Amino acid sequence: LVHVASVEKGRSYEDFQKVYNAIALKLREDDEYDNYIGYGPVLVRLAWHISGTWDKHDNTGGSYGGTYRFKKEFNDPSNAGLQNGFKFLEPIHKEFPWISSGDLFSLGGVTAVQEMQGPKIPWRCGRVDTPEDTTPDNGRLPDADKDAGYVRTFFQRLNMNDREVVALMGAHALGKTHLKNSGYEGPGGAANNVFTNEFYLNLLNEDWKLEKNDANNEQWDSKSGYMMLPTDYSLIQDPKYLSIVKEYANDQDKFFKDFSKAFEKLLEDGITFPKDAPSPFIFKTLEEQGL
């Protein structure tokens, strides 16, 4: 498979900035979702899940085809809870019916990060909706009950190295696990709808205790009311992952620079950009626009 990016016919930067502004105005407005966390964290989990299906060996999966719209992907056990993010984006797709699905699902993750005060993520348009039979089978997304070796090996399929896995994992400062979606319960920090390096500071400064939860799964819990998944706690058990955690715990700007680069790479894997294609767009936030 090759997947060539094709710009939506006749669309330029200003059209995409209007789709970004529509997502971001609706984030401001529907602030009550999930105990006033708001939809920003489930929107960056939807952009990572429609991208995380990619396989570097045969070029299948990834964000290009927008195949989450199909039942098989939508109903994947690992995607439980993402229907909430889908339902959010749906009025915005009726309002801009020209944007492809993979372009809308991935821009939602870009808008969410930047509106939650995170780094600017460059975004490229050009994903094309592909047919129902291009939809990846369930099972390509990661398990949480595992160790640092599993993590390294899993992310190699999407060819992410150590620095990219640890930067990418910092998004677990956001939102929370929900027992009915994943068998895990609780948040990773206090500021869970603002993008900061808090996940690394909690992982290095809290007194974590291993406990089973009401679903019979293990997680690392702290006195403060936070939790860490096994795969999260892995990052301090591995010597290589541990120096990087320390680095970001001490430098939020390095974390932001590295998260920006890795998350754009995750969103573009499996896609070929012709050099006639437009350069990546840097979208202004509502605040930068006075809106």
Among positions 3, 45, 124, 140, the unique one binding ligand HEM when judged by CB under 6 A = 45
Query: Binding pattern to ligand HEM, positions 183-202, x when CB under 6 A?
Result: -x------------------
Applying CB under 6 A, which of residues 69, 178, 246, 261 lies at the interface with ligand HEM? 178
Is residue 245 within the footprint of ligand HEM (CB under 6 A)? no
Contact status: 42 vs ligand HEM (CB under 6 A) = yes
Reading the block at residue 46, the tokens are 């939807």
Among 168, 203, 236, 244, binds ligand HEM (CB under 6 A): 168
Least Cβ distance, residue 177 to ligand HEM (angstroms):
4
Stretch that binds ligand HEM, among 55-63, 129-137, 177-185, 281-289 (CB under 6 A): 177-185
CA distance 62 to 54: 4
Give me the least distance between CB of 143 and ligand HEM, in Å please.
Answer: 6
Of these, 38, 65, 66, 175, which contacts ligand HEM (CB under 6 A)?
Answer: 175
Sign of the alpha-carbon torsion through 94, 88, 66, 160 = positive
Distance separating alpha carbons of residues 255 and 196, to the nearest angstrom: 9
Based on CB atoms, which residue is closest to ligand HEM, 184 or 256? Answer: 184
Least distance from ligand HEM to the Cβ atom of residue 145, Å: 8
If one asks whether residue 217 binds ligand HEM (CB under 6 A), the answer comes out as: no
CA distance 42 to 34: 10
171 binds ligand HEM (CB under 6 A): yes
How many residues line the site for ligand HEM (CB under 6 A)? 23
| Among the listed residues 7, 81, 122, 162, the single contact to ligand HEM using CB under 6 A | 81
Using CB under 6 A as the binding rule, the residues of this chain from 17 to 36 that contact ligand HEM are none
140 part of the interface to ligand HEM, by CB under 6 A: no
Question: Which residues of the chain form contacts with ligand HEM (CB under 6 A)?
Answer: 41-42, 44-45, 48, 81, 142, 144, 151, 168-169, 171-172, 174-178, 181-182, 184, 231, 263
